[PDB]
């Protein structure tokens, strides 16, 4: 198993906490569909560069970037209203990522608590988790971007630090360990004191890479032993 960088060395860990958008699920390539086969109409390309303008963006914001540089006709509002549409209908054949599976298996099988944190509100969250109810039951608890305890979404840490605090009992914050795909789960992980692996889109700039304690090109090159956690068997 190789890793693609460290930032630091691995401290231990006793809980760990998981983004579900990207790195659990193949959500991102879903956006991707939809964004493209609107884009298509025009001629035009939703490419990485454009996808990476508006990461980290609500859906208004990025509707109206993606409408200024591509150079569609349509007000933001209305691909907004256009794209959810289709992502309803395709949110359900969301798929597991690589390595899921065998990570929260091994996880269950050792008593390592693990709970969900994500941006997703209810409704889209029961879409994307829809035919997958019991791999999701699997995790100690969820927390969604609508939760009441979340005042600020990522970059800031709210996310994460409502999401330790619901272990009972709750660890110290340095001792979780979080797994994203995305450069603000990243900082938020950081900057809510934790220490963070990250899965980062092949097309991703290395520059923004930088910051997370592990890079991966997949959560199958996860070594649990690096933090001291037990190997796989
Ligand atoms: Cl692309
Ligand atoms: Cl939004
Ligand atoms: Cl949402
Ligand atoms: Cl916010
Ligand atoms: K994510």
Do not use: Y
């Given at each position: 198993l190789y890793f693609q960088s460290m930032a630091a060395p691995p401290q231990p860990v006793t809980h760990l906490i998981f983004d579900m958008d990207?790195?659990?699920?193949?959500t991102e390539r879903l956006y991707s569909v939809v964004f493209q086969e609107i884009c298509n109409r025009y001629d035009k390309k939703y490419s990485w560069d454009v996808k990476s303008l508006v990461m980290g963006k609500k859906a208004l914001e990025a509707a109206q970037i993606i409408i200024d540089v591509l150079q569609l006709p349509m007000s933001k509002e209305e691909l907004v209203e256009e794209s959810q549409t289709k992502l309803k209908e395709v949110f359900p054949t969301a798929a597991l990522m690589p390595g899921a599976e065998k990570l929260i298996i091994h996880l269950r099988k050792h008593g390592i608590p693990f709970a969900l944190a994500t941006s997703s509100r209810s409704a889209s969250f029961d879409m994307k988790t829809s035919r997958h109810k019991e791999f999701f039951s699997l995790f100690s608890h969820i927390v969604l971007?609508?939760?009441?305890?979340?005042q600020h979404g990522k970059p800031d840490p709210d996310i994460f630090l409502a999401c330790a605090k619901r272990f009972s009992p709750p660890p110290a914050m340095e001792k979780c360990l979080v797994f994203e795909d995305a450069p603000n789960g990243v900082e938020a992980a950081l900057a809510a004191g934790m220490q963070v692996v990250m899965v980062p889109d092949?097309?991703?700039?290395?520059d923004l890479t930088t910051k997370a304690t592990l890079v991966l090109?997949?959560?199958?090159?996860?070594?649990?032993e690096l933090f001291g956690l037990p190997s796989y068997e």
């Open positions: 990207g790195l659990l699920l193949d971007g609508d939760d009441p305890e979340v092949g097309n991703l700039s290395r090109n997949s959560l199958q090159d996860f070594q649990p």
